[PDB]
Amino acid sequence: WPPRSYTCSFCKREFRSAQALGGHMNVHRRDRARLRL
């Protein structure tokens, strides 16, 4: 993802903070799982 806040490419959530971002992906965890990197 690009800098200047982060957005989830699944539910379109907003979070500049990595604390919210990292945890937010955990609540998804559906299919793909890294895919390649």
- The span from the CA of 21 to the CA of 19, in Å, is 6
Q: How many residues bind Zn ion (CB under 5 A)?
A: 2
Q: In angstroms, give the least distance from the CB of 8 to Zn ion.
A: 5
Which among 5, 36, 7 has a CA at the least distance from the CA of 24?
A: 7
20 binds Zn ion, rule: CB under 5 A: no
25 binds Zn ion, rule: CB under 5 A: yes
Q: In angstroms, give the least distance from the CB of 30 to Zn ion.
A: 12
Binding stretches for Zn ion (CB under 5 A): 8, 25
